[PDB]
Design an enzyme around this catalytic site. Structure first.
Site, PDB file in Angstrom:
ATOM      1  N   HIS A 189       0.810  -1.222   0.000  1.00 18.31           N
ATOM      2  CA  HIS A 189       0.000   0.000   0.000  1.00 18.31           C
ATOM      3  C   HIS A 189       0.842   1.271   0.000  1.00 18.31           C
ATOM      4  O   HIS A 189       0.278   2.369  -0.126  1.00 18.31           O
ATOM      5  CB  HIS A 189      -1.066  -0.020   1.100  1.00 18.31           C
ATOM      6  CG  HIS A 189      -0.543   0.157   2.492  1.00 18.31           C
ATOM      7  ND1 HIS A 189      -0.721  -0.783   3.487  1.00 18.31           N
ATOM      8  CD2 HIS A 189       0.092   1.201   3.069  1.00 18.31           C
ATOM      9  CE1 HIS A 189      -0.198  -0.324   4.618  1.00 18.31           C
ATOM     10  NE2 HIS A 189       0.310   0.871   4.384  1.00 18.31           N
ATOM     11  N   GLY A 246       2.501   5.899   9.986  1.00 18.59           N
ATOM     12  CA  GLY A 246       3.888   5.682   9.632  1.00 18.59           C
ATOM     13  C   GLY A 246       4.484   4.397  10.157  1.00 18.59           C
ATOM     14  O   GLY A 246       5.648   4.098   9.850  1.00 18.59           O
ATOM     15  N   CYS A 303       3.569   1.266   9.462  1.00 15.85           N
ATOM     16  CA  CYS A 303       3.466   0.097   8.595  1.00 15.85           C
ATOM     17  C   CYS A 303       4.836  -0.338   8.116  1.00 15.85           C
ATOM     18  O   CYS A 303       5.753   0.473   7.949  1.00 15.85           O
ATOM     19  CB  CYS A 303       2.541   0.365   7.433  1.00 15.85           C
ATOM     20  SG  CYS A 303       0.842   0.459   7.946  1.00 15.85           S
TER      21      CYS A 303
END
Ligand SMILES: *C(=N)[C@H](C[C@@H]1CCNC1=O)NC(=O)[C@@H]1Cc2ccccc2CN1C(=O)[C@@H](NC(=O)C(F)(F)F)C(C)(C)C
Ligand SMILES: *C(=N)[C@H](C[C@@H]1CCNC1=O)NC(=O)[C@@H]1Cc2ccccc2CN1C(=O)[C@@H](NC(=O)C(F)(F)F)C(C)(C)C
EC number: 3.4.19.12
Lengths: 306, 306
Positions: free
Chosen positions: B41, B143, B145
């Site tokens: 993503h 932030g 991920c």
């Protein structure tokens, strides 16, 4: 979202752990530049634990009575000295992994991460607090001495604890990295025992602020309290007195949430008097006191879930 | 003595964390040998989060649309591919700090350590479990991920989780390191929500054994139960069924303590029916289910405090 007991990343400390042996005793040391720091009780023998004279024990040792092992590599000891309850073994090699570091002596109520080690090898990491009675509720077994506690700021490791002793209630005692014990404890086998402990009020308040940041307000109320009246209740529940300095330290969390400190004190007062009535806060059925205000700011969003 | 939520030392993982940027999106990647693994993503844009076609989004990207930063050093991307929900960015430099590692897909009920990171920089470490509903109760912000979960055995890091999503209840969803989600979740903005969760029975039993090892027996009783009768009670309290395989796994803890598994089940049955009556176990007022049998053996003494 979420809120966990969160330790600092331990890598910078892992690279400093070594094994120290004297006689038949092995424990851990901390290798920074060309010095290895370890508990002085590495020089004791089993028949002389009640009141060792460490000066007399150490004068009988040479550099070569100390074996230091970093991984698979032997470091040769080229000098030694005793500072309070730690030994400083000068070695022939500077640790190439030495991080930027400081030694700090922490105040009761402050938290730190512990890197539990055995035989110079790190085993696990967890978070603890220095209790008001200067014990720590650690998790330590035979061979764990010399494991250290620390905080990290930017790239700088602030070492604040070295592990030495377990007390009869299963809690722990140790020193700063200059070898001064926290609390009345010492490195001898005596009847020493943890004094009565108290709950760290400013930390409980910080954790209630964390719960609000993360979206939970169930425990708030419409009341306020004066500081004096709150402390009359704190004392009844074996909570540490809240000072104006604590109130000041809670300023940022109060501002982020819009809940005045004394209003959060009124919420805590109600929780103490009424209990939680089967509910939980941040997954706990007890009022948690091992998060400082800084720990909350470090972990939580800067934006409240309104 | 003591018993803490204990994470693995994180250093071997810290040395693998990098920052990945695509467009205006920055998150973390895992750099092993000459590949950086990150959530796919990273290629999304805000107006296309409801049902991104990742194949169509990725074909429009070149290697040079991906920026990878390890500390202060830029790594040049020389290839890319998508595997399930992760991207594998081939870079021009093999990570010199790559540990011995494996990728594992864990079963529900297993625990792991999480190294929470932001902008490629480790922030903290904590322990979590894969819940029966395939969520994790993590602590993660914008932030985060690409942060990973792992276990360590000897010198080998077994990566088992990469962080992707936060669900409406504030719990977390993510993938194995091959990019397959745990649970029914996915990398799109939909109404997906955590299914009903259950308590991990075998873990609660393991933690009761930990309490006995550490010297506490208050919650035991003189009764036993059959497995079938225990599970009739487990179901009533939203506990996972206990299987014979779980009983077998509890064998070593049962042997160390002298408490047969089904006898510990009778203790747990009584705790569920009666509550703890204001008492605590290992410092908790709730029955803890995020320690596996292995976690207990890893942390506790091999000698029971009889
Ligand atoms: C360090 N390796 C070890 C850590 C202990 C072992 C069990 N859990 C721990 O945290 N430290 C000791 O065993 C110390 C060392 C020592 C130095 C001088 C004199 C006596 C000792 C024995 N140690 C103790 O911790 C003992 N406790 C006490 O004597 C007292 F309670 F603190 F007074 C004991 C745990 C009974 C071995
Ligand atoms: C990763 N950096 C971030 C981690 C989140 C942010 C807040 N706490 C976390 O754990 N992940 C996201 O923001 C993802 C990314 C994504 C990919 C595809 C489509 C939509 C998104 C937005 N993300 C969410 O986690 C959102 N959740 C959901 O859409 C759902 F609940 F899982 F369905 C949201 C937290 C609402 C931004």
């Amino acid at each position: 979202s979420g809120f966990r007991k969160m330790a600092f990343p331990s890598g910078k400390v892992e690279g400093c752990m070594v094994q120290v042996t004297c006689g038949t005793t092995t424990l851990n040391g901390l290798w920074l530049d060309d010095v290895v720091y370890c508990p002085r009780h590495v020089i004791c023998t089993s028949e002389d634990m009640l009141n060792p004279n460490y000066e007399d024990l150490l004068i009988r040792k040479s550099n070569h009575n100390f074996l230091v092992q970093a991984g698979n590599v032997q470091l040769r000891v080229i000098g030694h000295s005793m500072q309070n309850c730690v030994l400083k073994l000068k070695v022939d090699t500077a640790n190439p992994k030495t991080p930027k570091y400081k030694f700090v002596r922490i105040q009761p109520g402050q938290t730190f991460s512990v890197l539990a080690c055995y035989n110079g090898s790190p085993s696990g990491v967890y978070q603890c607090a220095m209790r008001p009675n200067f014990t720590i509720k650690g998790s330590f077994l035979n061979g764990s001495c010399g494991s250290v506690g620390f905080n990290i700021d930017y790239d700088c490791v602030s070492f604040c604890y070295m592990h030495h002793m377990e007390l009869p209630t299963g809690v722990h005692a140790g020193t700063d990295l200059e070898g001064n014990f926290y609390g009345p404890f010492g490195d001898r086998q005596t009847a020493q025992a943890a004094g009565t402990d108290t709950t760290i009020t400013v930390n409980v308040l910080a954790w209630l602020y964390a719960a609000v940041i993360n979206g939970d307000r169930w425990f708030l109320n419409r009341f306020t309290t004066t500081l004096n009246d709150f402390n009359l209740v704190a004392m009844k529940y074996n909570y540490e007195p809240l000072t104006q300095d604590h109130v000041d330290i809670l300023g940022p969390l109060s501002a982020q949430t819009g809940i005045a400190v004394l209003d959060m004190c009124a919420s805590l007062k109600e929780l103490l008097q009424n209990g939680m009535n089967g509910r939980t806060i941040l997954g706990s059925a007890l009022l948690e006191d091992e998060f400082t205000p800084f720990d909350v700011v470090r972990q939580c969003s800067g934006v409240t879930f309104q």
